[PDB]
Each structure stands twice: as C-alpha cells, then as structure tokens.
Design a protein around this ligand. Sequence first.
Ligand SMILES: [Zn+2]
Lengths: 24, 213, 132, 133, 98, 59
Amino acid sequence: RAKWRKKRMRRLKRKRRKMRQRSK
Amino acid sequence: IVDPFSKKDWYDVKAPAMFNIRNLGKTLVTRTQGTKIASDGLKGRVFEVSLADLQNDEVAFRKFKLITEDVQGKNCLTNFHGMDLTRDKMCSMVKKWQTMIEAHVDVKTTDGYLLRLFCVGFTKKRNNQIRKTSYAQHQQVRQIRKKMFEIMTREVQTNDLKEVVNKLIPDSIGKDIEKACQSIYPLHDVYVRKVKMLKKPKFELGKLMELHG
Amino acid sequence: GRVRTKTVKKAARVIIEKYYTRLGNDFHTNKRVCEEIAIIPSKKLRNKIAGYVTHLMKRIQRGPVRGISIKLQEEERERRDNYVPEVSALDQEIIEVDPDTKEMLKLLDFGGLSNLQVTQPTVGMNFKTPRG
Amino acid sequence: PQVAEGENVFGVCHIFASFNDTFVHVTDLSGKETICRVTGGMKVKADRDESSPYAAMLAAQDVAQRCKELGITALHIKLRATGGNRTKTPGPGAQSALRALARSGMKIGRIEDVTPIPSDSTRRKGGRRGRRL
Amino acid sequence: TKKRRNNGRAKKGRGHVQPIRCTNCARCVPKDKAIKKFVIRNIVEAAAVRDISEASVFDSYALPKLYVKLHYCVSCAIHSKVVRNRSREARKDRTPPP
Amino acid sequence: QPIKLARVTKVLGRTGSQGQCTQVRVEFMDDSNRSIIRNVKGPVREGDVLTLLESEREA
RNA sequence: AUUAUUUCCCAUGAACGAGGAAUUCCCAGUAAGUGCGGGUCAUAAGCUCGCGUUGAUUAAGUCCCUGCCCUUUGUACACACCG
RNA sequence: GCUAGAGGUGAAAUUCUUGGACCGGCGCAAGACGAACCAAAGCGAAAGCAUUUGCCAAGAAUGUUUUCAUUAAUCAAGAACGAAAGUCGGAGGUUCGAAGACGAUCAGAUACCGUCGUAGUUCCGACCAUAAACGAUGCCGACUAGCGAUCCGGCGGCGUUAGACCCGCCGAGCAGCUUCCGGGAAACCAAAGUCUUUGGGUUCCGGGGGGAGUAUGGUUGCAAAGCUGAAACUUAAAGGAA
Ligand SMILES: [Zn+2]
C-alpha cells in the first residue's frame, strides 16, 4: 500500500536522523 | 417466600371535574406496615391517560398526565400534571417537503403553576399548488413562531390551571394560532404537542377538592 | 409441446400465399393439396404443414394474418373499407370556439361566422399536474 | 380488586423487544407497581433464543396467567425498541408476545410505541467504519 | 473511470455535510450519500392483526404504525438487498420502483 | 365451531417452497357469500368440495 | 483343480427380527417382483447387455436444497482464480 | 416497585447480578449532541455551516434615469484562513475510543467480533498547515442549442385564499435532461465546445516507468513533521479508456 509504504519511509527517516545525530 | 401481592390494597383513581369519566382506573399499593404509609407510595404516581378515555368522546392521540396529590378513603385524587401527543401522531404529522415551526414558552398561570407549552405547526400545501415543496422563509418562520409566543403566553397567563386544561381538551390554543398565522403562511397541523409543568405552588386541599366538585 | 418449427410455419405460409384458392378448412383436403403442390420428403412433415395450413385458413376467414400477404385479399379488404356516414362528422350545426381561437379567425377574413359559438373561458390556470 | 360485572381492570404491559432478549413487563396503570415481568431468558435454556418469537410466547403466556390471578383483564401496550442510538426496530419477540397476550384471553387497548428517541444521539458504539463483521 | 456523475451522493454546490450512522453497522456515512428508506409499518403485522382486533376493548380502534426512518451505508444496503446493482444504462433511472 | 363445507371455484396458483400447497379461492355452498381463499395440499381442480375445519382466518 | 473350476448327495445350521448419521434410482406396462437369452465360456454368472412375465403407490408441481445455463455487474485476471 | 437472571454473539465467553443486576416509576446531576423536518435545496474564499431568542459587524444577488470615471484582469515575492489527527498549557472528561488488557474465532490474530479502557474526543489560549483539501476539471471575458424544474430578487397577469397558491418574463445561482452544436483515445463533456480553418488575457504546473518526494543543503516547528529538492544506478514498458 502506498500509505503504509509512506509510513515505513517516515519510520526510516526518523532512524537515519537519530543515527546521524549520534555522530554529530 | 410469601406472596407480596396479598399485602396490597386496590385504590381507585379519580380524575378532576374537568372530565366526565372520573374513575379512570385502579392502582394498588402495599398496606400501611410499620412507617411505610400507603398514602406515601400513592402521592407521587403519574397516570398517563389518553384523552379518548377522558371526558366524553375526544381524540385518542392526546394524552393527559394526572399526578395523585391526596388519597381520601380508598380513592386517589389526581390533578393535572402534563399533556403530550402520542408517538404515532407526532411521527405522522412530520412529513417531507414542508417546514415545521416549533415554539415553547415558560409562562405561569394566574395561580402559580409554571407551565412549559410546546407548540408545533406545519406549512399547508394549497389545493391548487403545483409546487412539490411548501417551505416558509426564515423571516416567515420567525413571524409564525412569534405568533405562537404571543398566543400561547396570552392564553395561559390570564387563566388558572383549571381554565387552561379546558382549553387543552379541545385544540383551542392551537386553532387560534392556525388562524392567526394564516396571513403569514397557511398551516394545517397546529397543536400544543407537549405541556410541561415546571413549578407547582404549595399543595392546598381546598383547591384540590374544588377541582373535584 | 405442440409448437411448430419454422420449417412447418414458413412452408405453410408460402403455400397459402401461392395456393390460397385450393385450400380450405379440411385437413385431409389440404393434406392432398400440399402433397402435390409441394415436394415434401416426409409424410409427418406434410401432416404438420397441412395441419398448420388448416389452422391459418381458419384465421384468414376472420381477418388478415400478420404473416400471410395475399394481393387479392388485401385489395378487397381495403375496397370494402369504404364506409362513410350519411352526414359528415365535421359539418356541425354549432361549433364551440375558444375566445382566443375566435380572435385568430378575426385576424383572418373569417371574423364573424354564424357557425361559431364563443365559450366562456374558464378561470384558473390549473392545467399543469402537481409535482412529486 | 373490587370489580363488578367483569369490568376491565386495565394494566400497562411494557414490552421491551430487543434483538438479544424480549421483556414482558406488566405494571399497574401508573407504571410504578410491577405485577409480573417475564423475559425470554427465563423461558429458554440457550441464550441465543432469548429474542426468538417462541421465547416471547412463553414469556407472555406466563405473565398472562399471573394477571388473571389479580383481576387484571385488559392491558395497555407500551412497545419500545432499545431506544438510544441503537436499532429503533423492535426485535422478533414484539408481535409474538403481543399476540400471545390476546391468545390468552386477555383484553388489549391503546397500543403505543414508547421507544425513547433522542433529539440527537451521542457517539454511537462502533468506529466510523462500523461493525465490520 | 467515473462510474457516476453525482459520485454516488446527492451533493451539489456544497463543501461538507454532517454524517450519520448506518443501521446495520454504526459507521459514519454522509447524509446525502446515505441510502435512506422511510418505512411505515403497522405495530401488529397481518399474521396477528386478527387476534388483536377481536381482543380489543374498543368498538373501532385502528392499530398504530411505526414511523422509522432507516439509514443505510452503501455496503450494508446492498447486502440487505434494498438496492441492487443495475445495468450501465439502467443506473440513470432515478424513479423509485412501483 | 362447526366444520364448514366449501366448494372450489377457482384455482389461483401454487404456493410453498416446493409448490406443495395450492392457493385456491374456495366459496361456501350454504350461500354465495364468503368467497374465502384457502391453501390446499394435494391435487385440486375447479369443482372440488373442501372440508374446512376452521373457516375464520383466511391465510 | 491343492489355495476346495464348476456340479450332485448326506451332514454341519452362523450372523440376520427392516437396519444409525447419511444416501441412491424412478412418473406407466414405468418402479418393483419373477425367470429366460446373449456377451465372457474347454469348465462358467451373484456381473453386464437384452427379453418377456406379473404389475403398482405417488406426482401433471416448485427454486426450498443440490447441480449447471443465461442476463446484469465487478476485475490489476487473458497461461484466464489451478489466475 | 416486582423479580433471577441480564449484557453480548454466527454460537459463546470475559463482564454485570448471591441477591437487588436487567425492567418499570418519580426525580436529580454532569458532559456531549441538535434527530425526524433535511432536499442532487441554501450560504461561505475554501475548510466548513442546522434548537430558541437577543446582540455584533459583515455579504452576494436584485432594484436604480444615484455617484466616481478606467480606478481594471491575473499574479513572483509576501500574507490571511485552512477538516481530521497530532503538539503544549488550563478547564472538563457523558458517550465513544488509538494504545493496552481480557474474552472469542483461527493452524497462527499481535486482526476482523465481544467486554473494558489510556491518550483522544469537549472547552479556552498558543502551535501545526497537511487530506481522494475532488467537480481528481485555475481565474476573468466573449460567443455557440432546446426543455422542464429549482433558490433569491424584481416585474405584470385570470382566478382562489387570509402574504399563500396559480401563469409568464428578466437578472443571479445549485443542478437535471434531450440533441449528430462541436470536441475527445474513449468513457463522457452546453463545456472538457468555438483547435493543423492552430494566437482574448494571465498564473501555477507536466516531459517513459523506477530510484524518490529518497540523499544532501537551506528554511519552518516544542515535537511530529512542513516547504524547497538531487544524482548514481536500474528498466521496455508503466499507464489511460474501451
Ligand atoms: Zn452499514
């Protein structure tokens, strides 16, 4: 589904951000 | 274990003198045992009686609430407590392709009974009308509702409880509204759909017996 | 289950449209006519064809059949349709005319005629039917 | 009751007809005192048939003989259907219990529907997508 | 493909309408999209009207009726067979069945 | 109540799930009135005499 | 011919007292009973294909069930839902 | 008040009742909501908007032989508003109900179904600025058919009724239908027409399908996220209508 794929994307952006702030 | 209905007396229910049929029915209550007086269990019951079972031959879609106020020797004396139309009557008058004007006034009588009359009125389709809908404009509805506010208040604020019920057994308070609102927008089903009794004065045995004279 | 096939009905109509003068209301007479004027490879088919001819012959004597078209039958039935009353239905003693129709004739050369009788125009325009 | 020449002693029979059960509640004329109240569950073993029309027959025949023992010969009918925001249509035991009251030699008078209808209901049970059974 | 010109609802020149609940499943359905049906039936059906009339205390008492306005969602109105799927040309018929 | 005796006048059609009951308008023989409709089980034709045990309800 | 090919004689005399849930066939010379013939066949019918004999009950109806057919409808299927 | 069951379900159980649940009566309190009337009807820039009454300041249309006299149209930047959910701080929390628990169903349900129930739903203030925010159809203007209705205003006509109705016309608007106006890939569209017989004005915006509304940078926000927004690489189809 295009909405749950959008939800999986936002759950992935939130992980890439926290992984990027750890090494900031 | 013991049958509780063997300890109950059947009391008579008497309607006010406003109607011809006085004995509207019979009620039962537990005998005076200990401190539970049988009159205490009777002085708060409300009897919702149809107007057809009332005075002589009136309509059957109007109901009168009669609350028992004092018991005098195996017969309960009831007084006016309210009035309302039956469910099938109101649900049949509300048709489509027409507007309904509802009004309510909290106006007391000349003796102390604070009544809350509910009036309803539906726009009438003319005999030669080709239009399907009969809708009154907003300002026409306000003029019809203001006419109900004026007539309902005038009809009760100058009379007591005994005289306003004599105007409720026939649709007197509803017929004069239909005639007054005819110049604004003709109506066909104008009734006082409900009468709520908000506040009552102190109970007087002299006025109750006068109501059954 | 006594419905005739298109083979029985079509062959029966062609026999009538070509040999109407030889056929009648008797099956056994038409059974021998169809046997000669038509080469039918079967006897059961002949009895079905001749039996339906007898049925259609009973219909011709009462009126025209929507399948059979005979020239000598259609011309006579149209010739015998010439019926007229002793007096026409149009030339009436008096004629009711609406006042609006009277004004139309007034614009024409036929303003005042004795045959015209103006009727009272009905008041109230209640010609439309109520909606809903 | 002190009644003569078989004069009718009218009662009020509140019939709560739902899709899960059927109440046959006979009260006095005012509705305060209860004479007898028999439901569909009091007459059927399985709880799936508490609203069946057969259960309302037994619930109405049992309540009719109780009114015979107290001189109650006629009954006013007050039919309600679950009120509120739920279904406004009476359950299967509505007409079955009412016919069984007349079948039991009991008189009927002034039938009335008293289903409590809201001027506007609150948030009804079930999501915006409803019961997706 | 646009299956219906009115999009399955009687909303024209209007932004939003208040919703209602289907009688089968209490789901939010717009008031115009709702498949309404105003059913007027007697309290006593024909199978029992004979016994109730002969057991009445009045000489001539007409049995009342049940004025219920039913609302249906598109899904439940079709499972309950109150509306059927019509041909592509029959869908344009807006007259109630006789 | 007595056992009424009616005579079949018109056969309407077949009723029932499997078409076992025939819907027949059966009038009485004592008088021309009361042309009631009954459901009959078995082979029925116009002219049959039925033995109505109960003739109050139409059904 | 033993694992008895069939057949005859004497003896042996078992379950089975109309049969659960289910389920089959059938509308007139039909069901069913009854025997005969053909096929198989060196030996040969509890099978099957035919034949006559005796001869009914019920039904001349319905979509209720179970089967397919058609129309409408939906499809991202077209190797076509075993998609 | 009388009674042993009530609730719920396809069927049940969890749950409510060892007695006073459910039911009936008279009441009371709180918080929501504004049924039927209610419509392919109205209004508003959209979102959205329905009990009564009062108040506040706006608004289209119509009417006008009033006034001003081009003051206009569309719009980068910029700005107001913007359902629901969400966020923060107060008040309130009836119903409903994410989460969660438990009871069913199933091979398994962490789902559908049932009994509860947190946040939420309600109100006030401050954020958020996203919807299948849809008529999937920019705004302004002209022109090109017909018909019956409908909402508002105005106009003149039999008649009925005590303004209501009836019959037309004009302007404005929500729609409907019939048509070989024409258009289109077609469905369909009086506009989605007046288009190879191509140009009324103007804004935004699309360039095979994926990667991807992802990476990075900037910006906005308390946060969730909003706005702006790639490439490498991969692919011969993806897709529309019928
Ligand atoms: Zn539903």
